[PDB]
Design a protein around this ligand. Structure first.
Ligand SMILES: CCCCCCCCCCCCCCCCCC(=O)OC[C@H](CO[C@@H]1O[C@H](CO[C@H]2O[C@H](CO)[C@H](O)[C@H](O)[C@H]2O)[C@H](O)[C@H](O)[C@H]1O)OC(=O)CCCCCCCCCCCCCCCCC
Ligand SMILES: CCCCCCCCCCCCCCCCCC(=O)OC[C@H](CO[C@@H]1O[C@H](CO[C@H]2O[C@H](CO)[C@H](O)[C@H](O)[C@H]2O)[C@H](O)[C@H](O)[C@H]1O)OC(=O)CCCCCCCCCCCCCCCCC
Ligand SMILES: CCCCCCCCCCCCCCCCCC(=O)OC[C@H](CO[C@@H]1O[C@H](CO[C@H]2O[C@H](CO)[C@H](O)[C@H](O)[C@H]2O)[C@H](O)[C@H](O)[C@H]1O)OC(=O)CCCCCCCCCCCCCCCCC
Ligand code: CLA
Ligand code: CLA
Ligand code: CLA
Ligand SMILES: CCCCCCCCCCCCCCCCCC(=O)OC[C@H](CO[C@@H]1O[C@H](CO)[C@H](O)[C@H](O)[C@H]1O)OC(=O)CCCCCCCCCCCCCCCCC
Ligand SMILES: CCCCCCCCCCCCCCCC(=O)OC[C@H](COP(=O)(O)OC[C@@H](O)CO)OC(=O)CCCCCCCCCCCCCCC
Ligand code: HEM
Ligand SMILES: CC1=C(/C=C/C(C)=C/C=C/C(C)=C/C=C/C=C(C)/C=C/C=C(C)/C=C/C2=C(C)CCCC2(C)C)C(C)(C)CCC1
Ligand SMILES: CC1=C(/C=C/C(C)=C/C=C\C(C)=C/C=C/C=C(C)/C=C\C=C(C)\C=C\C2=C(C)CCCC2(C)C)C(C)(C)CCC1
Ligand code: OEX
Ligand SMILES: [Cl-]
Ligand SMILES: [Fe+3]
Lengths: 102, 254, 334, 105, 59, 134, 33, 58, 37, 93, 53, 141
């Protein structure tokens, strides 16, 4: 997952030891290991996709980039005409106002 | 301004003057070039210079109106001609004398500007040219003509202003991560400006000799070239462009 | 009494509202055509191929570009440092695509502040005073020569110069510190000690005057109304502000000569910006900053990183990503 | 790198460089055949190891293809690595190079 | 030859006495009206020994 | 540290022990005779063949041993053993065209080629990799 | 194993620093200047 | 104050719109992806050489 | 290097370019000894 | 394109896939890079895997050096975005 | 002429400083030589191809 | 206690070359048979390039014949220097030293007749430098 300090993060896949296994690379030429090279399969569990598993290599890269944001969610963004950049909570807006007033 | 008038000039008096891209004239008429069916042959030094770049634009676009090629103005520099497009001529299709492309500066990336302020870029090339002409003699007539495949303007490893590319680059609008965080029907699908397609199209040419010399110095003739323009790796629709300038060549006996 | 001397005594007349002297015969028409092209090409210039790689950059107000993004874009790198005026173009819009507006502003602006600097001499002659405010203006004029002219002279094209815009200056600084390491250069190091030091001594000397004013005023009204303009006496005790600051640090760390104090105000930022303007111009000919990459090694020869390596991992990351498709060969201008 | 990729068998003209322009060989704004890349700003170079390859219209495409004699590859590979790019403590590099040479020009 | 080697070594010894004791002798209140050709003797043997070192360098 | 500088001599795995002096002699002579083109194992004028531990092994004489590297600087070849790249590369054979190869002995070619094999044993990812491991 | 060069470089530096303030130190002593 | 959202929507919806602001964003992703393995070593950023954003030819 | 007769004097000509820095610093010593008068 | 199914053949594995692989992908096999892979990227084998062994302008000892690594080569449909940067690729160490 | 002496004394002492650290295998520019390229432009000691003897 | 050294004592970080002198012999022989054959090999090459200059004088293309005298023949004065310091006797060395000097003088007068675009004057300086090239090769043996 991307930490809170970053803003763009490469979508690297790790095991439970920290070692990489797939990376969806920036440079496709002479990429040693990619999503479709090692062939990762998504097995969804719970939610809207309870039991939907697919090994299509274009559709694995779609839900790989979203799951570095932490959890996948269906967004209704034709209501407020949303622009697609993350705003800040009232926990973080209060602290901008109050540590600058003080 | 022939070859034998141009080779006597030093580089210190050609450089800067705009004469180094001027497709040299090759004075002569009442001549022919015989091409034997057994002997090997090659065009060399095939300089091709266009003039009067014209992009086909629609004027009515509903009905009862043509697509008149509006005259544009050149926008980059004097970088537009081609130099040294040698290739073997000795192939003979049941008569036709065809020459295929071998090497040289086939392409020249220039932009022109339509009326309205829009700059169209295009890749004026003759890469993979296969031009046939009816007959075995060359001079004062015998119009060549064939199809050339243009490549796309940008290649696959051309990065965008936002770091997307065909061969390289990001595969998402990475400055909008909240649009990527949608799961169903909103996951940057609005953009297929992301999936960059190196697409390859074809263009036609037709060139007349319009002058000859029986020793060397083949044409100093004219040409008419119809061609597509840049598609921005599959982002905008290409326009047709019509180029009509002066080419020149030289046949050596091989 | 002559037909020229009656004109020659109008140009060198101090009775005008702005002084229009013999250096002002050159800086008034050159800056006014470096203003009239800057104001028009900030609003309504077309996009400019800066790199010569046939990808234009759109830096004017018509093409989007809120004013912390708009810039008069530098020239094409295919042009280089070649002289590119309007009459050496095939058309006026072909001149705009290659970025002709950038040498037309920046050769007239540089020739205008060079004759602002002589005009700052010139009124100090006709008013009868010591003339070295031209020397103090030679620190911004050299610094405006270093980013605009000498860095295009050393590094080749005019595209390497500073863009005339706010976000162009931030792009100029990141690309500079990628390839020249200005942060670890010991003459830029002196310039930020003349910029922080000059900002210290402004906040230090300006404080000790305004904290030791003698009260020629009432309580409720403003303090500045107690200095009648053109008066003979001093408005503040220099002996009390010296006795303040002689208690703050110690007694002989403070100038109770106010002429040597005020010269030290004119020496610390002006010499510091003289050393910055050298440093950018010596890095223009690629005499870069200090390079302590991989210096600390242990006994086995394994490289131990120091703090100059974490600067270098920043310096390398803004090296591979600036000019993202303008490089075809592995070394940058080598 | 015009030499090296020609020695790998490329037609060194019709390069199709990444921005659409010439990678190795390109056209000058006045119309001369010059080197492509970032080095098109230094197109007005007169240098005694390449001026035996310039004709009247810039670099000749026939003299480059055949008569490219290996004293010129000696002088190109030397002058590329001995570039005027250094440091104040005399480290030769592009300012992000590790220190193993003391060279400023 | 090493006879040249001790000659130029005698030049750097003598010029060390010459470069110190010339501006001492000039800028004393005395010692210049008295000892002009103590300097010009020392400057003469310095310019003398350079010529002797000069054509012995050919041999 | 630096106890093991056990670089292989020739093929079939006979090794040699370098000693401290032959390493300070090697690094000071690899610098200012090679390292203006090989700054950390890269080749600046031909970057798809360098001084990796892998890329030196994948040549027609494998150059991961010192006796094939002494034969390299005495008589250079290309990466497939066919041609002789000597007029575009400095060597003892071409030391008239390259004046830096004119004065150094055979005993410090062993010091220079001892440095090519020591550097992946202490600087393993950095030697021969590009600027990514800087 | 003696260095013999920076011995000679610093014994000649000690000669050089004993030239400049050997003129002034004798001239302060003898009231000249 | 990282980005102008008016110009990030436009540069995603036009692949030939570029400014010095849009060039300044790509320089920031070079800094944040190359320095991150060395600046914050507790995070163990094990970015391979193929996934960090390089430009072209260097 | 140097000629073979003068090769012993190589530690002598290593600091001789530094003497024009010492001539600038000699003027501050001479001014301080007379008392900056 | 954004998705390409033949990315595992372009290097960083075995099975070079000669049609659109780079010239420096042959560095990982000995006896393969400089002049024997001149004729694999020029007059290239756009037919099959065993069209590269029936290729001409090779010496017979060069044709046996391809025979050591016949299983490290496939033939893919030739994409035009990778044929253009087959010789340079913009990828130096 | 005291100061014209110290210009020539720099040219005397630096040119002896360049030739002391000569090392004839390297070129002139690989050693930071600044007055020996001014004398090799005038043809003292320079041979064919640019090397000096 | 740290192992510190004062102005020498050559450890791995001491920047001093008062130690580390060369032990073995210089294995590049200064003038052997293999590169002297290469100097004879380029004299076969350089004589063909001055022979090639005659058709470009007749074609009146100056930047070929001002460039082909620098293209392959750049390592000609270096190789003609190495041949005359290879011979044994001194009185035969004067015969090779003089027509190497009469070659160089003849060669740049052809260049001065090349920049001034003088076809009638460059053809005699070509043939004078040609027979001085053949006079050089039987002087050096
Ligand atoms: C005294 C008389 C002075 C006459 C000055 C003049 O004739 O001034 C003429 C110029 C303008 O010249 C025009 O300059 C134009 C520049 O076009 C560019 O600028 C245009 C502005 O709308 C558009 O944006 C267009 O898309 C873009 O390409 C075109 O090239 C026209 O062909 C050309 O006639 O005015 C200027 O400089 C403005 C001067 C202030
Ligand atoms: C106050 C500031 C005022 C500034 C006003 C600026 C606008 C006024 C009008 C122009 C004045 C000069 C500016 C341009 C100077 C320049 O581009 O100078 C560059 C030229 C060199 O020109 C180069 O010359 C080269 C010649 O090389 C050719 O020839 C060579 C020899 O054969 C080689 O062979 C080479 O291969 C071959 O290419 C190339 O042609 C290059 O393209 C070309 O740029 O320098 C030279 O002419 C000699 C040096 C000229 C003076 C440079 C001074 C720069 C300004 C200093 C200001 C200091 C401010 C101090 C504080 C106040
Ligand atoms: C109260 C006051 C307090 C103090 C404040 C005032 C400080 C005054 C200034 C002091 C600065 C000098 C300190 C000593 C510097 C030094 O020891 O420096 C060390 C060097 C010599 O050190 C030697 O430096 C050598 C450099 O040579 C190398 O580099 C050469 C050229 O680059 C060649 O490339 C060659 O390959 C290679 O050998 C080697 O590294 C040696 O190992 C090393 O011993 O001294 C030198 O040269 C110095 C020679 C004079 C340089 C003349 C100026 C040249 C540059 C002017 C333009 C710069 C403008 C920007 C500047 C900001
Ligand atoms: C104070 C007056 C002044 C000065 C010094 C300049 C100076 C300049 N203008 Mg300019 N300009 C001015 C007023 C001035 N302008 C005004 C009022 C206008 C509006 C009409 C313009 C409009 C204008 C345009 C539209 C352009 C310039 C350009 C230029 C540059 C080159 C012009 C040239 O070749 O001159 C010729 C000069 C000479 C032949 C004189 C040479 C000999 C004298 C004695 C000087 C020698 C100096 C020294 C001895 C060496 C130059 C920097 C061009 C540019 O963009 O440059 C990049 C350009 O395209 N100017
Ligand atoms: C803890 C507070 C602190 C202290 C004691 C310093 C002290 C210093 N900084 Mg520093 N700095 C600070 C905070 C601090 N800084 C902060 C918060 C920033 C912004 C991130 C900077 C940014 C900064 C830069 C960019 C540079 C310094 C430099 C310097 C040195 C000279 C500056 C100078 O002469 O000022 C004027 C003061 C007097 C004349 C008195 C000095 C050692 C410069 C340096 O390297 O010099 C050695 C330098 O380049 N600093
Ligand atoms: C705390 C950190 C810090 C500080 C204090 C500085 C401080 C400075 N940096 Mg620096 N820098 C930093 C961090 C820092 N930097 C970092 C992190 C980087 C790497 C990204 C850089 C990269 C960098 C570069 C690349 C350069 C600097 C430069 C400078 C100097 C700029 C001020 C100057 O000389 O302008 C002087 C003043 C001017 C140029 C203005 C000229 C004014 C002209 C004459 C007239 C004005 C015309 C105007 C339109 C008229 C007004 C209109 C009227 C109607 C009112 C100053 C010393 C520059 C420098 O020293 O050289 C110039 C430089 O080129 N820095
Ligand atoms: C733009 C010009 C404006 C003026 C700028 C110049 C003046 C500014 C001051 C800079 C000069 C400082 C003094 C000289 C330092 C370098 C001398 C040196 O050691 O050479 C360093 C060189 C190194 O020699 C190196 O050798 C190599 C061979 O393998 C290469 O050939 C290198 O090229 C060569 O540089 O020689 C020495 O080692 C001499 C060492 C002798 C030890 C005592 C020296 C004492 C010198 C300083 C005395 C104090 C004076 C300092 C200034 C006081 C005021 C702050
Ligand atoms: C000293 C007083 C001078 C007069 C007052 C100053 C007025 C300032 C004008 C504002 C700046 C204009 C900048 C040009 C802006 C610009 O770039 O214009 C460029 C403009 C564009 O040319 P085109 O692209 O149309 O070129 C034509 C080709 O495209 C056709 O194929 O050229 C013109 O149309 C003529 C403009 C100059 C005409 C000037 C008059 C010429 C007469 C000279 C008289 C000399 C005697 C004077 C005696 C003192
Ligand atoms: C101490 C001196 C040197 C050593 C030990 C050395 C070592 C090597 C080695 C072992 C190779 C691989 C040869 C192969 O696999 O075919 C190589 C390649 C190369 N070296 Fe060096 N080298 C030295 C000096 C230089 C210098 C100074 C240059 C720069 C002019 C240079 C340029 C090259 C080039 C271009 C290659 C690649 C050859 C090719 O592409 O076929 N070498 N070096
Ligand atoms: C042979 C030889 C040698 C030797 C040489 C010599 C011995 C020389 C001498 C030299 C000398 C012996 C020199 C000197 C010089 C000096 C000078 C040049 C001076 C100057 C002075 C001045 C400049 C001063 C000034 C001042 C004044 C006037 C007053 C006060 C202030 C002052 C101090 C500033 C050797 C061994 C090395 C090597 C080999 C060769
Ligand atoms: C050639 C030669 C020679 C000569 C030499 C010379 C010519 C010298 C000179 C000169 C000099 C050598 C001078 C000196 C200087 C010194 C010093 C020692 C330095 C410095 C000092 C200081 C720096 C201090 C200062 C101060 C003061 C006191 C005041 C104020 C404060 C202060 C601290 C700043 C001889 C004969 C030997 C022989 C050999 C060679
Ligand atoms: O464009 Mn502005 O810029 Ca500072 O570099 Mn050279 O050319 Mn580009 O580079 Mn890396
Ligand atoms: Cl480039
Ligand atoms: Fe005050």
């Amino acid at each position: 997952r991307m930490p809170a300090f970053f803003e763009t993060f490469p979508v690297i896949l790790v095991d439970q030891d920290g070692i990489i296994r797939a990376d969806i690379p920036f440079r496709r030429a002479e990429s040693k290991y990619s999503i479709e090279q090692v062939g990762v399969t998504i097995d969804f569990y719970g939610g809207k996709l309870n039991g939907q598993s697919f090994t299509d290599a274009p559709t694995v890269k779609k839900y790989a980039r979203k799951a570095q944001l932490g959890e996948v969610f269906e967004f209704d963004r034709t209501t407020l005409e949303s622009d697609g950049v993350f705003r800040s909570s009232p926990r973080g807006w209060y602290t901008f106002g109050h540590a600058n007033f003080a | 301004f022939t070859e034998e008038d141009f080779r006597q000039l030093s580089y210190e008096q050609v450089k800067g003057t705009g004469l180094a891209n001027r497709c040299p004239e090759v004075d002569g008429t009442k001549g022919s070039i015989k091409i034997e069916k057994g002997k090997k042959y090659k065009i060399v030094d095939m300089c091709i210079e266009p003039k009067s770049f014209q992009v086909e634009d629609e004027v009515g676009k509903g009905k009862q109106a043509r697509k008149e090629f509006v005259d544009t103005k050149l926008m980059t520099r004097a970088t537009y001609t081609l130099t040294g497009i040698e290739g073997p001529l000795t192939v003979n299709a049941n008569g036709d004398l065809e020459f295929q492309e071998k090497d040289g500066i086939d392409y020249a990336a220039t932009t022109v500007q339509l009326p309205g302020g829009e700059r169209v870029p295009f890749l004026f090339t003759v890469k993979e040219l296969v031009a046939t002409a009816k007959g075995d003699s060359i001079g004062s007539g015998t119009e060549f003509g064939g199809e050339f495949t243009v490549p796309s303007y940008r290649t696959g490893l051309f990065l965008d202003p936002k770091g997307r590319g065909g061969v390289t680059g990001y595969d998402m609008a990475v400055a909008l991560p909240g649009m990527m965080a949608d799961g169903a029907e909103g996951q940057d699908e609005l953009f297929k400006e992301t999936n960059k397609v190196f697409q390859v199209t074809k263009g036609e040419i037709e060139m007349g000799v319009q002058k000859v010399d029986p020793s060397t110095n083949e044409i100093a003739g004219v040409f008419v070239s119809e061609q597509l323009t840049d598609t921005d790796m599959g982002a905008k629709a290409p326009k047709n462009i019509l180029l009509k300038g002066v080419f020149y060549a030289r046949i050596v006996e091989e | 009494a002559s037909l020229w001397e009656r004109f020659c005594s109008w140009v060198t007349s101090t009775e005008n509202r702005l002084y229009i002297g013999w250096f002002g015969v050159l800086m008034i028409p050159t800056l006014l055509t470096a203003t009239s092209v800057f104001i028009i090409a900030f609003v309504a210039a077309p996009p400019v191929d800066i790199d010569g790689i046939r990808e234009p950059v759109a830096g004017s107000l018509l093409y989007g570009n809120n004013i912390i993004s708009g810039a008069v874009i530098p020239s094409s790198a295919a042009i280089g440092i070649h002289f590119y005026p309007i009459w050496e173009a095939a058309s006026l819009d072909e001149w705009l695509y290659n970025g002709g507006c950038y040498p037309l502003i920046v050769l007239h602006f540089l020739l205008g502040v060079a004759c602002y600097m002589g005009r700052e001499w010139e009124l100090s002659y006709r008013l009868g005073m010591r003339p070295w405010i031209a020397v103090a203006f030679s620190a911004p004029v050299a610094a405006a020569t270093a980013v605009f002219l000498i860095y295009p002279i050393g590094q080749g094209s005019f595209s390497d110069g500073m863009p005339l815009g706010i976000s162009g200056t931030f792009n100029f600084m990141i690309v500079f510190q990628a390839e020249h390491n200005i942060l670890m250069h010991p003459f830029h190091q002196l310039g930020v000690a003349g910029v922080f030091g000059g900002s210290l001594f402004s906040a230090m000397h300006g404080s000790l005057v305004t904290s030791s004013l003698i009260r020629e005023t009432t309580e409720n009204e403003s303090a500045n109304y107690g200095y009648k303009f053109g008066q003979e006496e001093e408005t503040y005790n220099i002996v009390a502000a010296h006795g303040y600051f002689g208690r703050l640090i110690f007694q002989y760390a403070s100038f109770n000569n106010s002429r040597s104090l005020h010269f030290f105000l004119g020496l610390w930022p002006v010499v510091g910006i003289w050393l910055t303007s050298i440093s950018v111009s010596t890095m223009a000919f690629n005499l870069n900053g200090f390079n302590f990459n991989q210096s600390v090694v242990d006994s086995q020869g394994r490289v131990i990183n120091t703090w100059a390596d974490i600067i270098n991992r920043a310096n390398l990351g803004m090296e591979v990503m600036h000019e993202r498709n303008a490089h075809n060969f592995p070394l940058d201008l080598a | 790198f015009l030499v090296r990729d020609q020695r790998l068998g490329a037609n060194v003209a019709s390069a199709q460089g990444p921005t659409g322009l010439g990678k190795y060989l390109m056209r000058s704004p006045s119309g001369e055949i010059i080197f492509g890349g970032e080095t098109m700003r230094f197109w007005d170079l007169r240098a005694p190891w390449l001026e035996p390859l310039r004709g009247p219209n810039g670099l000749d495409l026939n003299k480059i293809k055949n008569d490219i004699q290996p004293w010129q590859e000696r002088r190109a590979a030397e002058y590329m690595t001995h570039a005027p790019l250094g440091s104040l403590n005399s480290v030769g590099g592009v300012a992000t190079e590790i220190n193993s040479v003391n060279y400023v020009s | 030859v090493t006879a040249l080697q001790i000659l130029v070594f005698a030049l750097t010894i003598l010029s060390t006495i010459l470069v110190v004791s010339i501006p001492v002798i000039l800028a004393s209140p005395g010692q210049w009206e008295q000892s002009k050709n103590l300097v010009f003797t020392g400057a003469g043997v310095w310019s003398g020994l350079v010529i002797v070192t000069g054509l012995l360098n050919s041999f | 540290d630096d106890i093991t500088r056990t670089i292989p001599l020739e093929a079939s795995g006979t090794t040699i022990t370098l000693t401290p002096e032959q390493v300070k002699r090697g690094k000071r002579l690899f610098n200012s005779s090679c390292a203006i083109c090989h700054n950390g194992g890269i080749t600046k004028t031909n970057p798809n063949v360098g001084l990796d531990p892998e890329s030196l092994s994948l040549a027609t004489p494998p150059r991961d041993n010192v006796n094939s590297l002494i034969d390299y600087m005495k008589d250079p070849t290309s990466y497939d053993g066919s041609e002789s790249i000597a007029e575009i590369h400095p060597s003892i054979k071409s030391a008239d065209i390259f004046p830096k190869m004119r004065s150094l002995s055979d005993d410090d070619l062993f010091a220079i080629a001892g440095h090519i094999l020591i550097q992946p044993k202490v600087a393993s990812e950095k030697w021969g990799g590009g600027k990514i491991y800087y | 194993m003696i260095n013999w060069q920076v011995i000679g470089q610093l014994v000649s530096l000690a000669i050089i620093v004993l030239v400049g303030p050997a003129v002034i130190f004798l001239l302060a002593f003898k009231k000249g200047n | 104050a990282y980005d102008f959202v008016s110009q990030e929507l436009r540069a995603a919806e036009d692949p030939e719109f570029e400014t010095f602001y849009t060039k300044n964003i790509l320089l920031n992703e070079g800094i944040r992806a190359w320095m991150a393995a060395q600046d914050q070593p507790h995070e163990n950023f094990i970015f391979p050489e193929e996934v960090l954003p390089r430009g072209n030819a260097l | 290097a140097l000629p073979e007769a003068y090769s012993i004097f190589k530690p002598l000509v290593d600091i001789l370019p530094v003497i024009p820095v010492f001539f600038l610093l000699l003027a501050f010593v001479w001014q301080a000894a007379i008392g900056f008068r | 394109e954004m998705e390409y199914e033949g990315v595992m053949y372009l290097g960083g594995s075995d099975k070079i896939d000669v049609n659109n692989a780079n010239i420096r992908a042959y560095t990982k096999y000995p006896g393969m890079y400089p002049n024997i892979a001149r004729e694999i990227v020029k007059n290239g084998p756009f037919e099959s895997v065993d069209d590269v062994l029936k290729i001409e302008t090779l010496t017979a000892t060069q044709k046996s050096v391809v025979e050591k690594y016949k299983n490290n080569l496939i033939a893919l449909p030739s994409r035009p975005e990778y044929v253009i940067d087959k010789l340079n690729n913009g990828l130096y160490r | 002429v005291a100061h014209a002496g110290i210009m020539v004394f720099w040219c005397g002492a630096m040119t002896l400083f360049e030739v002391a650290h000569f090392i004839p295998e390297k070129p002139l520019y690989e050693q930071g030589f600044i007055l020996l390229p001014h004398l090799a432009t005038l043809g003292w000691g320079v041979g064919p191809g640019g090397e000096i003897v | 206690a740290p192992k510190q050294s004062f102005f020498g004592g050559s450890s791995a970080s001491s920047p001093f070359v008062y130690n580390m002198k060369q032990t073995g012999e210089i294995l590049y022989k200064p003038l052997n048979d293999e590169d002297l054959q290469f100097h004879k090999n380029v004299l076969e090459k350089s004589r063909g390039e001055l022979d090639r200059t005659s058709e470009q004088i007749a074609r009146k293309s100056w930047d070929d014949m001002r460039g082909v005298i620098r293209n392959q023949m750049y390592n000609m004065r270096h190789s003609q220097l190495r041949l005359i310091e290879s011979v044994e006797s001194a009185e035969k060395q004067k015969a090779a030293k003089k027509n190497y000097n009469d070659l160089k003088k003849s060669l740049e007068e052809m260049d001065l007749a090349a920049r001034n675009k003088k076809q009638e004057d460059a053809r005699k300086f070509r043939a004078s430098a040609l027979k001085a090239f053949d006079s050089f090769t039987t002087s050096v043996g």
